[PDB]
Design a protein around this ligand. Sequence first.
Ligand SMILES: *[C@@H]1O[C@H](CO)[C@@H](O[C@@H]2O[C@H](CO)[C@@H](O[C@@H]3O[C@H](CO)[C@@H](O)[C@H](O[C@H]4O[C@H](CO)[C@@H](O)[C@H](O)[C@@H]4O[C@@H]4O[C@H](CO)[C@@H](O)[C@H](O)[C@H]4NC(C)=O)[C@@H]3O)[C@H](O)[C@H]2NC(C)=O)[C@H](O)[C@H]1NC(C)=O
Ligand SMILES: *[C@@H]1O[C@H](CO)[C@@H](O[C@@H]2O[C@H](CO)[C@@H](O[C@@H]3O[C@H](CO)[C@@H](O)[C@H](O[C@H]4O[C@H](CO)[C@@H](O)[C@H](O)[C@@H]4O)[C@@H]3O)[C@H](O)[C@H]2NC(C)=O)[C@H](O)[C@H]1NC(C)=O
Ligand SMILES: *[C@@H]1O[C@H](CO)[C@@H](O[C@@H]2O[C@H](CO)[C@@H](O[C@@H]3O[C@H](CO)[C@@H](O)[C@H](O)[C@@H]3O)[C@H](O)[C@H]2NC(C)=O)[C@H](O)[C@H]1NC(C)=O
Ligand SMILES: *[C@@H]1O[C@H](CO)[C@@H](O[C@@H]2O[C@H](CO)[C@@H](O[C@@H]3O[C@H](CO)[C@@H](O)[C@H](O)[C@@H]3O)[C@H](O)[C@H]2NC(C)=O)[C@H](O)[C@H]1NC(C)=O
Ligand SMILES: *[C@@H]1O[C@H](CO)[C@@H](O[C@@H]2O[C@H](CO)[C@@H](O)[C@H](O)[C@H]2NC(C)=O)[C@H](O)[C@H]1NC(C)=O
Ligand SMILES: *[C@@H]1O[C@H](CO)[C@@H](O)[C@H](O)[C@H]1NC(C)=O
Ligand SMILES: *[C@@H]1O[C@H](CO)[C@@H](O)[C@H](O)[C@H]1NC(C)=O
Ligand SMILES: *[C@@H]1O[C@H](CO)[C@@H](O)[C@H](O)[C@H]1NC(C)=O
Length: 393
Amino acid sequence: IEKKIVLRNGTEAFDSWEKPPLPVYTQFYFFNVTNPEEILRGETPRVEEVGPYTYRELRNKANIQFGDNGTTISAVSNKAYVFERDQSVGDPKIDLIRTLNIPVLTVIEWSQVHFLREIIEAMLKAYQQKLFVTHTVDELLWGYKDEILSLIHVFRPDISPYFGLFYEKNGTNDGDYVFLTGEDSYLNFTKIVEWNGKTSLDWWITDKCNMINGTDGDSFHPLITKDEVLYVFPSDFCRSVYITFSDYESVQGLPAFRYKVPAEILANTSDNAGFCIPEGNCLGSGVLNVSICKNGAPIIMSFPHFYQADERFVSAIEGMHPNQEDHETFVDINPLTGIILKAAKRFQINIYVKKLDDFVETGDIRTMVFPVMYLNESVHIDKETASRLKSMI
Ligand SMILES: *[C@@H]1O[C@H](CO)[C@@H](O[C@@H]2O[C@H](CO)[C@@H](O[C@@H]3O[C@H](CO)[C@@H](O)[C@H](O[C@H]4O[C@H](CO)[C@@H](O)[C@H](O)[C@@H]4O[C@@H]4O[C@H](CO)[C@@H](O)[C@H](O)[C@H]4NC(C)=O)[C@@H]3O)[C@H](O)[C@H]2NC(C)=O)[C@H](O)[C@H]1NC(C)=O
Ligand SMILES: *[C@@H]1O[C@H](CO)[C@@H](O[C@@H]2O[C@H](CO)[C@@H](O[C@@H]3O[C@H](CO)[C@@H](O)[C@H](O[C@H]4O[C@H](CO)[C@@H](O)[C@H](O)[C@@H]4O)[C@@H]3O)[C@H](O)[C@H]2NC(C)=O)[C@H](O)[C@H]1NC(C)=O
Ligand SMILES: *[C@@H]1O[C@H](CO)[C@@H](O[C@@H]2O[C@H](CO)[C@@H](O[C@@H]3O[C@H](CO)[C@@H](O)[C@H](O)[C@@H]3O)[C@H](O)[C@H]2NC(C)=O)[C@H](O)[C@H]1NC(C)=O
Ligand SMILES: *[C@@H]1O[C@H](CO)[C@@H](O[C@@H]2O[C@H](CO)[C@@H](O[C@@H]3O[C@H](CO)[C@@H](O)[C@H](O)[C@@H]3O)[C@H](O)[C@H]2NC(C)=O)[C@H](O)[C@H]1NC(C)=O
Ligand SMILES: *[C@@H]1O[C@H](CO)[C@@H](O[C@@H]2O[C@H](CO)[C@@H](O)[C@H](O)[C@H]2NC(C)=O)[C@H](O)[C@H]1NC(C)=O
Ligand SMILES: *[C@@H]1O[C@H](CO)[C@@H](O)[C@H](O)[C@H]1NC(C)=O
Ligand SMILES: *[C@@H]1O[C@H](CO)[C@@H](O)[C@H](O)[C@H]1NC(C)=O
Ligand SMILES: *[C@@H]1O[C@H](CO)[C@@H](O)[C@H](O)[C@H]1NC(C)=O
């Protein structure tokens, strides 16, 4: 039986789970801001799309421990990025990007006491701080010492002087996980049952929204059916997500079902009401306020170029040209085994920006969801692992 697919010491399923043989890549694309001064005078932003900066991933399950009479398994999943110049537009240690000053907007947000806010402006004034700043791709991705934060750190040692979109993420894991192994039922293969000791999330408004559904998205139960909907808990996206069957496809020499992230996921629906922290008040279709889980930083999640989002989000920023073939999230799963043969996980990091009377640095900036960068975390099965699998398929 395809019951061969269980996380039990000695199975091939286990080994490929513990030491993933498939090479995963992350490609970074940034939006270079061309008119900072004009943006501050209330004009429409104009951005230029820079990328890729291709990094090959290094993945490994650590701290593995079995449980509940072989029903469960606990582990962490370490991810490290190795830069590939040959596959990139340029050197991230040289190439520059003018974008928003996330540390300053992050600090302005954190302040809701007048004294606190008076202190911050004083520092911005004195230090001649700006809303639009230029850094290397490397500094933006991996971290740079910020002047304002360095000074805050002196008074509040809990506050880090460093900032990066992926700061302290090279080598680390996304917390402790306890997975249900396919021993009790195959449908229950790699199903997440706990994340950081909690069986559910606590940062959303409704019981439904806070649910931890599905697998980490790196695998799925065997014997899938064209009609079922598949759930994924992408830790980074801060909520569970489901994917729906699109069509049949052939990867290497193996059959697959093309599963895509449907529009409904981030649409302004009743089932997505609880993803709106201001007492139900929603920003709009195609965007997620990930502020609660991003330690108060004004981060807004979306899909690249605001694909599957409200037209107003696209009109807002000049240089946004969404399309399905370039911005969608798909995954080609071999139906029999549940093994991902080809995939593309694509999402965008945005900042919620607006004119603040207390902060001259904002000027007359339009109230908007500002694009910073998006990525393409992708996978493609190799001829060696594919041939190995054809024996089973
Ligand atoms: C991670 O995700 C990103 C997307 O966010 C990917 O990057 C994109 O890669 C696309 C291809 O995968 C790029 O799209 C191309 O852009 C070209 C112009 O910039 C355009 O010319 C290309 O069009 C051809 O391909 C289409 C199919 O996709 C065809 O329908 C079309 O007619 C074109 O056909 C070619 O041209 C003639 C006419 O038929 C033929 O003689 C050729 O043989 C045809 N070739 C092929 C292969 O069909 C296409 O739209 C896009 O530029 C790029 N964008 C960015 C920002 O990077 C990453 O690739 C992705 N995955 C990985 C693993 O990297
Ligand atoms: C993202 O957008 C930003 C802003 O537009 C952009 O940054 C700019 O990059 C250019 C280089 O591409 C920088 O220009 C240099 O500036 C220094 C002085 O500050 C000059 O000495 C340099 O002079 C050279 O110019 C020519 C070669 O480029 C030669 O003819 C000449 O002899 C010199 O060698 C050069 O002008 C500029 O400093 C930045 N601007 C800012 C705000 O930092 C960035 O490159 C864009 N990113 C991408 C990847 O497109
Ligand atoms: C996490 O997972 C649960 C279960 O997988 C999700 O809840 C499920 O949501 C669907 C629709 O929101 C419910 O189905 C409904 O069935 C009725 C009856 O046929 C139909 O009228 C509706 O149109 C709809 O199809 C389903 O009952 C419900 N199940 C449970 C156990 O709650 C939940 O939404 C997911 N949460 C996240 C954040 O992904
Ligand atoms: C994105 O989510 C954040 C929360 O993560 C939203 O911020 C919250 O905004 C509300 C207003 O709708 C703030 O509530 C009020 O705050 C004052 C000051 O403390 C208080 O006296 C009032 O009684 C009320 O609670 C709330 O403080 C704030 N939450 C946090 C944690 O900062 C934000 O509005 C969302 N962004 C967008 C663009 O919608
Ligand atoms: C992320 O961490 C990894 C592991 O420390 C880095 O990759 C290796 O480590 C050193 C870095 O100087 C070098 O031997 C090679 O670059 C890598 N070797 C192997 C065998 O992987 C990686 O460079 C770090 N990435 C970033 C973005 O800093
Ligand atoms: C698998 O095999 C033996 C069972 O005696 C055990 O010592 C070993 O540590 C197990 N492997 C893992 C990764 O736990
Ligand atoms: C996993 O699934 C099987 C049947 O689908 C069931 O017996 C088992 O209790 C499941 N666990 C949970 C908590 O859903
Ligand atoms: C979202 O939908 C609800 C009704 O379903 C509506 O009250 C709300 O204003 C809509 N959000 C936006 C941003 O228009």
